[PDB]
Ligand binder design. Structure first.
Ligand SMILES: [K+]
Ligand SMILES: [K+]
Ligand SMILES: [K+]
Ligand SMILES: [K+]
Ligand SMILES: [K+]
Ligand SMILES: [Mg+2]
Ligand SMILES: [Mg+2]
Ligand SMILES: [Mg+2]
Ligand SMILES: [Mg+2]
Ligand SMILES: [Mg+2]
Ligand SMILES: [Mg+2]
Ligand SMILES: [Mg+2]
Ligand SMILES: [Mg+2]
Ligand SMILES: [Mg+2]
Ligand SMILES: [Mg+2]
Ligand SMILES: [Mg+2]
Ligand SMILES: [Mg+2]
Ligand SMILES: [Mg+2]
Ligand SMILES: [Mg+2]
Ligand SMILES: [Mg+2]
Ligand SMILES: [Mg+2]
Ligand SMILES: [Mg+2]
Lengths: 140, 135, 93, 188, 95, 107, 166, 188
RNA sequence: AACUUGACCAACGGAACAAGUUACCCUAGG
RNA sequence: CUCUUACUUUUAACCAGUGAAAUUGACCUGCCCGUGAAGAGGCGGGCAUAACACAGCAAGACGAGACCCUAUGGAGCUUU
RNA sequence: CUGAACUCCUCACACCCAAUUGGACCAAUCUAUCACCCUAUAGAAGAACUAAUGUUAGUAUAAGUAACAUGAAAACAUUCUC
RNA sequence: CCGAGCCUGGUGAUAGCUGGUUGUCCAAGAUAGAAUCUUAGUUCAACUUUAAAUUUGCCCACAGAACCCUCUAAAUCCCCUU
RNA sequence: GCUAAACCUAGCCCCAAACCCACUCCACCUUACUACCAGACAACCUUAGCCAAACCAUUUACCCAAAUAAAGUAUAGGCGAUAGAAAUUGAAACCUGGCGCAAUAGAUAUAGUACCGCAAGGGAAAGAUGAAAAAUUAUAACCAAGCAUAAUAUAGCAAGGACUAACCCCUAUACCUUCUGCAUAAUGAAUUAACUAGAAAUAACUUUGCAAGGAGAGCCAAAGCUAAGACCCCCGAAACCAGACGA
């Protein structure tokens, strides 16, 4: 019994269908295509890590720009909002800066107020009472 | 090749020669038949004590297997099971131990030791194949 | 290229042709026939491969032994060479 | 597979015509022979080297047990019908075909009689013109045929024959020599 | 080692092994000590005594010897008055 | 792959769910063999699962066509004109039940 | 081989309704196995693309290349065929819709090299394909103007969306 | 020639896909394709929308005048029983009237400060051929529509959609129909 | 006869027993 | 040769006909410095940069292009 | 404050080590029996190729490149130049 | 390409050392030593796979392990508990 | 749109069974294929080297008449590698078939031709309509690489993330082999198609059968024994020997 592959055409098309949009002979010659396709598939897998990293970098850039419009540096806004028990993440804050400028200015005003309360407490020896916005809600 | 260590004298070569197996092919062999086995064969009706028991009856009852081509010279009766041996038999073997003979005699049986040569042993163990030769 | 552009002629197998309908009959000739004949006697084929199996080296040795004298000169020469080739191969030389 | 003989055979690089010399094209050794397996028209590196036998034998008791299982399987699934005889009113095959249909036997029927010589002529004539209605003697009974045919028909004498042969395996001794040679109680 | 003889297509026994080793039916191999007969004059009584002992081979050696011999050498034998008869079967071996 | 395939934005059909929820699946067409090992699961699904599914989803019209086939299939058609053909070849009843319910919930 | 070009003239269209605008006639013609390279022929086929039948004939008449005479004969045959068999009214009312060259069936010949090496020389053949369409030559697309450039650029700016956000 | 069938059959299906893409067949009505049962499709139409349609009224909604004329011409030329089919003209008028007044009341309540010209233009957009045809196509209305020409002409499709609204008005009353107007037209 | 003895087998896990030369070189890969 | 110059022929280049070979992982084929770098067109930093024929050039890429020891291999020939 | 495939979070969870071994599955082919728009359970085997200084065929690149060819006029008779 | 022609056969000759060795998934899975005309290789070792049987394995308290002069510290061996 | 693609036969392989061949006429051992002159030449003689011993120096194989078994036993042997009986035992065998190839396969074979070589000798490639071609404007087309339709626009292993958007942004040092686990330095690849490389079953394990017995003589057996399953690749020297051919 002599056996020969009879469906090799379909095996090649599995590679080639992913190479159609490539440039040059990579898009049709199987031996060239396969190598480029393998690199493409590898890049696609790794890119998911970069996608999350770059998205966070974009939100921080936009939040930094939005904060600068109110005279606030990015570290001051992010840190002080946490000290107000406001857990809005960077993605939402960037979305708010663009589509909800009045709400974002309030968040910037709230962060600026909390930052000033921290300054006053730092000058104080602790004898005075904590700032109104400084007060932390406790959970049990 | 197997048995080559890559240069040094192989283990199976550096051991001295000793006549462990010298003349093995010419040594006589006897299949052991115990009184336990003999009594068990009688109990199940495979060897009948009412007739003389020889190699043919032992082989016919599947009590022992004899290989003349492997230098078997017959059966050697062994004393294992002498305490519980109760049958009264007339049995012909090639070798018998002192205790085995006593066990048979104590029950009123007769035991005799007889010699068969390779050709004779082959015929006695399998009579029908011999008869078909036409000799 | 490399794949036929039309369907091959449809395959029509007669499952109930005489050969298939009677396949296996008498494979128990011995068990059911007082062991007058052994099932291996039913086997048709080369004289040296009836009721016997072996690897290629064993087959070549067996064929030369049984029909070597009747073989054609060139065939016998090839068989002798094959056995020598296989003897080294199967013995890890 | 036990009686299978494969006749497929290829030629090795040593058996292909020619190829003895080392090809000259520029040393001569770079290719040893034009009939190397890598060369078009060269020898086959690892092809079939027949004729190749597949002969082997299952233990006699196992083959006997297979027949018992096949018979038991047929009865348990209502595919076994016992006849007093295979005598027919007429030799016309259309009668046997209609009879099987009326009794809901199935597309294929295996008819087993005791002996080949004593098979009734009427059933012999009918089954000789039928592809799926096959008549065999008892000695020809085998697992493959039983599974191939949906329905199994055995005559009463065949039943006694089958039980005698198959049960003999259960109570027999180990063989001293082939059962073809004389024994005290065999045959019968 | 020949795995397939030229004339029979059967495995062959290494006769060098038969000359030097005894195989007990339990799978143990007995041998002599190398040089037990040589230069006795320069050997102490204690060294001479251990040189004339019949010693067992290790697991690795035993498996190699088994491959080098065919099944005939591993069969049970019933030699009359065999000195090694009792050693063919193991006793009280838990493993 | 993203670059090698098409893409679209998150969407609904006719603002489904805003006023009321409408099941987008409207038709299921099964092809089942009366004889055929690959259709064993589909045959079992039709015997014991299709009727209960039909009652649960009155909006969906289910056509079961029994005919000789090597590859049993289920064709799902949606209100937006989408046609999605799936194979139930050699699938068990549980696997076919999972696939059919998955088609029912897709838009 | 493939001979689809010859079959295109055999297409028959359903009678047009009175409302429909008159469909321009299309004539397909070619010459197989011309003794010429497709590479050289391509420049001649390219030159007459989009020209009127008379303009193409004029340019080819005064072209030195061997292929020009061959294409000119094909064009004259196509022009005669259009009026005679395809119900074209005015022979001059035709333009070169499609003009291309194709690889023919080539012959391999044993050739030689200066150092005694054995070589294969191919004797090259080609095909010339022409499609004539009834009517005047379609006017060449004009150059992109400054106004068109500005409109495109402003359109691109207006299509900008806020990327990667809600 | 390589022996085998599976690869050749698979490639035949591949070639058929290209034969379809190269020459995309002329679209046809769903009712002509396999796996179609009009009565079952009509029943699913109501249950899918969670509406208790009167089947007799709902079926009439899909009957367009053009369809009745075309059927008669086919019957006459192929001479062969009186047909009493009622067109959806009456139902579409009631549906169009209710939809216009229902949408007006909805918009006037939501946008009291909207001028009447603004309210009318919104009602024209919501009941416009564009919006209504888009909603009707995505609700399986076109699949159940009986018309001479496929694809259903925009005007015929819009008339059938309001005819369905007329059938709902008679079946379930004004309050239920209003929620249907809100869920499928106000959302637009 | 036996008990036993014997290779500076020093390349010392020891082939029973064998050197030069090739710039006319031949083959091998690195 | 200082120290080259002129002209003719061939080649050459252009037009027309005919029409090879070695070579070729892919190629969307830049410079400087750094990186083992005098191992970088492809890496880091910086600089440069609309696209695309033809004729030259031979710095680079790239190619056309002895000796060594090792293998428990030979052959001449030389004998201590 | 920024900053990992670390950790948490929603869900999933057997899915990143060469040779090698162990356990499953599987393309196509043939055979038995099914099946019957291309399948099932088994049996079998010339049974799967981007990794070759491999063979054969097709077609590229180099490249329309290197290279090749017919003395002159004419009435095509003839004459002229060498 | 004759420091010994060519051809066929012996011949799929031997050695040596490169190169190649074709579907998927899951589990386990990287050691660095001795002899040898042996160090470009091998076989016993080191690590490694599968199955099986059984009972301790690793970490480690005290006590304990030389005089001779120990550079004499950093450590080792042994070892219950955990 | 071209180039092309696609095909099913020609035959072939392995067995079985049967012991094959060959004087129309004429020509042909001289320079064969040459009608027609004193011949005289006559054949017989260990195969060798070498697969291996990892060198090599004795040493291993290719035949002699019955499958099986005795038995890989006796025995031979640098007693190393390796070689290896016999006595004795004693079966079946019905040509006309195939889990063989189907044009790179299967014979080298369309042919020992063309072609190459002084000679011995070496030695190819390929065909495809249909019932009818006394139906040829009939037999639709769709598919590798290569091209054409349709050259190109800053930037870089040519992609990936993406994006309204092809590109511009960001990220990314081709692959293989080998060198220590290190290739931007060394190897290999124009491309497409076809071809192209793991062949043991003693033990052990697993799953049946039977069980102090197992096995369809032989063999094994102190739970064994029988049967099955599953393990060992491809290309690539010089040399040496035998017999021819060639001044
Ligand atoms: K001058
Ligand atoms: K540098
Ligand atoms: K240069
Ligand atoms: K050939
Ligand atoms: K001469
Ligand atoms: Mg982060
Ligand atoms: Mg040969
Ligand atoms: Mg071949
Ligand atoms: Mg000068
Ligand atoms: Mg030119
Ligand atoms: Mg983790
Ligand atoms: Mg293969
Ligand atoms: Mg050039
Ligand atoms: Mg030139
Ligand atoms: Mg010239
Ligand atoms: Mg793992
Ligand atoms: Mg401890
Ligand atoms: Mg004999
Ligand atoms: Mg051929
Ligand atoms: Mg490199
Ligand atoms: Mg390589
Ligand atoms: Mg001369």
């Amino acid at each position: 019994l002599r056996n020969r592959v009879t469906d090799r055409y379909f095996r090649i098309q599995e590679v080639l269908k992913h190479a159609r949009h490539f440039r040059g002979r990579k898009n049709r010659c199987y031996r060239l295509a396969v190598r480029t396709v393998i690199r493409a598939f590898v890049k696609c897998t790794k890119a998911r890590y970069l996608k999350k990293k770059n998205m966070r970098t974009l939100w921080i850039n936009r939040i930094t720009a939005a904060s600068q419009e109110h005279g606030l540096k990015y570290p001051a806004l992010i840190g002080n909002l946490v000290k107000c028990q406001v857990e809005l993440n960077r993605k939402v804050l960037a979305d708010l800066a663009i589509y909800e400028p009045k709400t974002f200015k309030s968040l910037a005003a709230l962060a600026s107020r909390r930052r000033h309360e921290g300054f006053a407490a730092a000058l104080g020896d602790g004898k005075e009472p904590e700032g109104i916005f400084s007060r932390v809600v406790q959970y049990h | 090749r197997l048995g080559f260590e890559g240069g040094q004298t192989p283990f199976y070569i550096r051991i001295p020669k000793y006549g462990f197996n010298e003349g093995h092919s010419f040594r006589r062999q006897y299949k052991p038949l115990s009184l336990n086995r003999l009594q068990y064969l009688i109990d199940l009706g495979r060897v009948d004590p009412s007739q003389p028991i020889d190699l043919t009856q032992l082989v016919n009852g599947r009590g022992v297997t004899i290989q003349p081509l492997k230098r078997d010279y017959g059966v050697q009766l062994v004393e294992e099971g002498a305490d519980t041996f109760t049958a009264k038999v007339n049995i012909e073997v090639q070798l018998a131990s002192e205790l085995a003979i006593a066990a048979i005699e104590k029950n009123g049986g007769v035991v005799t030791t007889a010699f068969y040569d390779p050709r004779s042993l082959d015929i006695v163990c399998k009579p029908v194949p011999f008869f078909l030769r036409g000799q | 290229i490399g794949i036929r552009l039309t369907l091959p002629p449809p395959k029509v197998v007669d499952r109930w042709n005489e050969k298939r309908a009677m396949f296996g009959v008498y494979d128990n000739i011995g068990i059911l026939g007082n062991f007058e004949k052994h099932p291996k006697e039913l086997i048709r084929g080369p004289i040296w491969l009836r009721g016997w199996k072996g690897n290629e080296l064993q087959r070549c040795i067996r064929k030369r032994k049984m029909v070597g004298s009747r073989m054609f000169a060139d065939d016998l020469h090839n068989l002798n060479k094959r056995i020598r080739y296989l003897y080294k191969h199967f013995n890890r030389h | 597979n036990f009686k299978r003989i494969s006749y497929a055979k290829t030629k090795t690089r040593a058996e292909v015509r020619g190829g003895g010399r080392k090809p000259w094209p520029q040393g001569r050794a770079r290719h040893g022979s034009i009939r190397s397996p890598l060369w078009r028209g060269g020898g086959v590196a690892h092809g079939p080297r027949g004729p190749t036998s597949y002969y082997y034998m299952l233990p006699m008791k196992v083959r006997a047990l297979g027949l018992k299982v096949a018979l038991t399987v047929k009865l348990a699934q209502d595919d076994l019908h016992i006849m007093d005889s295979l005598e027919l009113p007429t030799g016309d095959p259309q009668y046997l075909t209609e009879l099987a249909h009326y009794r809901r036997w199935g597309d294929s029927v295996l008819l087993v009689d005791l002996t080949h010589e004593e098979m009734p002529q009427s059933i012999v004539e009918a089954t000789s013109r039928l592809k799926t209605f096959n008549l065999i003697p008892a000695v020809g009974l085998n697992v493959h045929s039983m599974l191939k045919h949906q329905t199994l028909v055995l005559t009463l004498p065949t039943v006694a024959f089958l039980e005698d042969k198959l049960l003999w395996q259960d109570s027999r001794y180990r063989p001293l020599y082939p059962f073809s040679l004389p024994y005290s109680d065999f045959p019968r | 080692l020949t795995y397939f003889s030229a004339r029979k297509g059967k495995r062959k026994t290494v006769k060098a092994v038969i000359d030097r080793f005894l195989r007990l039916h339990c799978g143990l191999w007995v041998r002599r000590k190398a040089g037990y007969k040589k230069k006795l004059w320069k050997k102490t009584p204690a060294r001479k005594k251990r040189l004339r002992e019949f010693v067992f081979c290790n697991k690795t050696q035993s498996k190699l010897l088994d491959k080098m011999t065919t099944s005939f050498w591993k069969r049970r034998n019933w030699y009359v008055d065999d000195p090694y008869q009792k050693y063919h079967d193991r006793t009280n071996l838990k493993v | 792959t993203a670059r090698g395939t098409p893409s679209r934005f998150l969407a609904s059909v006719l603002h489904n769910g805003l006023g009321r929820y409408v099941q987008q699946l409207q038709r299921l067409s099964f092809s089942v063999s009366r004889d055929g090992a690959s259709s064993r699961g589909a045959r079992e699904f039709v015997e014991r699962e299709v009727i209960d599914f039909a009652r649960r989803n009155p909006g969906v019209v289910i056509y079961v066509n029994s005919r000789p086939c090597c590859v049993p299939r289920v064709v799902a058609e949606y209100l937006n004109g989408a046609v999605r053909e799936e194979s139930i070849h050699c699938k068990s009843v549980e696997e076919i039940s999972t696939l059919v319910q998955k088609l029912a919930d897709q838009s | 081989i493939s001979r689809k070009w010859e079959k295109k003239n055999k297409i028959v269209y359903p009678p047009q309704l009175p409302g429909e605008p008159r469909r321009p006639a299309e004539i397909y013609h070619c010459r197989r196995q011309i003794k010429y390279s497709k590479d050289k022929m391509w420049y001649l086929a390219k030159l007459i693309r989009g020209m009127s039948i008379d303009q193409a004939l004029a340019q080819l008449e005064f072209n030195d290349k061997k292929g020009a005479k061959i294409i000119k004969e094909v064009l004259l045959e196509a022009q005669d065929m259009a009026v005679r068999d395809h119900n074209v009214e005015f022979r001059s009312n035709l333009y070169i819709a499609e003009s291309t060259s194709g690889r023919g069936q080539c012959l391999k010949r044993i050739r030689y090299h200066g150092r005694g090496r054995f070589g294969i020389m191919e004797k090259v053949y080609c095909h010339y394909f022409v499609k004539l369409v009834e009517g005047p030559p379609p006017p060449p697309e004009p150059p992109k103007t400054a106004v068109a450039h500005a409109k495109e650029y402003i359109q691109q700016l207006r299509s900008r969306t806020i990327v990667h956000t809600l | 020639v390589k022996k085998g069938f599976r690869a050749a059959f698979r490639f035949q299906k591949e070639l058929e896909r290209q034969r379809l893409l190269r020459c995309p067949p002329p679209p046809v009505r769903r009712s002509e394709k396999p796996n179609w049962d009009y009565h079952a499709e009509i029943q699913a139409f109501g249950h899918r929308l969670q509406e208790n349609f009167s089947l007799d009224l709902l079926k009439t909604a899909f009957v367009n005048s053009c369809y009745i004329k075309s059927e008669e011409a086919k019957r006459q030329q192929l001479g062969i029983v009186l047909l009493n089919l009622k067109s959806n003209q009456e139902l579409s008028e009631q549906g169009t009237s209710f939809s216009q007044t229902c949408l007006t009341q909805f918009l006037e309540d939501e946008y009291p400060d909207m001028p009447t010209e603004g309210i009318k233009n919104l009602v024209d957009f919501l009941t416009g051929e564009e919006v209504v045809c888009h909603v009707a196509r995505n609700l399986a209305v076109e699949q159940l529509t009986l018309s001479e020409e496929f694809p259903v002409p925009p005007a015929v499709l819009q008339q059938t959609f309001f005819a369905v609204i007329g059938a709902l008005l008679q079946s379930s009353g004004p309050e239920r129909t209003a929620l249907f107007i809100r869920d499928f037209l106000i959302t637009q």
